[PDB]
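Suppose you are handed only these lines of text.
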Amino acid sequence: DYNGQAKCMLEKVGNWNFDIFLFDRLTNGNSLVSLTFHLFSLHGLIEYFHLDMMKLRRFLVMIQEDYHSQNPYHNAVHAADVTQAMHCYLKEPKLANSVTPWDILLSLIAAATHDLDHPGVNQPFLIKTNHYLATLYKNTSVLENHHWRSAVGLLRESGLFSHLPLESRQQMETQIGALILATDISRQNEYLSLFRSHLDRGDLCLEDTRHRHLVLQMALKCADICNPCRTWELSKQWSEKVTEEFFHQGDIEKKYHLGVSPLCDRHTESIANIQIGFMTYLVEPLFTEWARFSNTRLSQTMLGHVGLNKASWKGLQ
Ligand SMILES: CC(C)Cn1c(=O)n(C)c(=O)c2nc[nH]c21
Ligand SMILES: [Mg+2]
Ligand SMILES: [Zn+2]
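From them, the structure of the protein bound to zinc ion can be written out as follows.
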């Protein structure tokens, strides 16, 4: 019954107003698997790459179950949301007319696995508490490298692409890594500045693989922080969840005298100001540049929502 209602929702998987929260409830927590499998079929990837559907479901389940459902924000639903957004971006004219099945395959896998096995705390926390991951990745994009190598592990274990040449599997791992690493927010200035420069010069050639993947990396960055670009009813829920996670880290830091990280103090930092600052300094700059690249109704709709939602938070003051 609810399963049948889930199928109908997927008919509008391309809508910016898709409700991932409802979709996950109807599928009993199977949103990432159900949505991603559907997108693989929709984009013809199963046929294009001669995929074994049994291995595909196993791979997707491995990913989904390796997310910590106990995290209020960084869980499989966030991953499914990012994947759904990435799908909407792949439908944008400039990408739709240039991406290959291989690019779509990598983009969706990257989106689905970009926060894999996230512990619910940030890089600075891992570094100051001497977590083994901080040592392993030399305090550099610690979380993102962890998500990437975790994804590589699942790719190899599932054998989903065992029929393709070794070189292809190795390239897949590298390109997915480039996509996942671009989601390290601490490096947004580097990616945004580069994207902005290319747009200023107007020299982006989408038939060039390197230029196209820079665009895909920017698309995934957009997908990762597009919560404020969704309609208020969805955006509001995302804001409460991410703040809940931040404040929980802050509670740990306070309890163990670790020093409270920025945006994590529930006693001195307002959820309203956290959201407003995030929208003003990180979201709007990125989506404004994205709008220059893809000057469509979707880009204007997303910017419109940030403006409204931003105003709503200021109003709640
Ligand atoms: C820290 C990182 C998850 C980026 N980030 C953030 O800083 N704020 C404030 C958000 O609301 C938010 N929502 C998604 N990502 C977010
Ligand atoms: Mg991340
Ligand atoms: Zn994310």
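What can we learn from it? The CA atoms of residues 14 and 91 lie 8 Å apart. The pocket of 3-isobutyl-1-methylxanthine (ligand 1) is lined by residues 185, 225, 227, 239, 242, 263, 274-275, 278 (CB under 6 Å).
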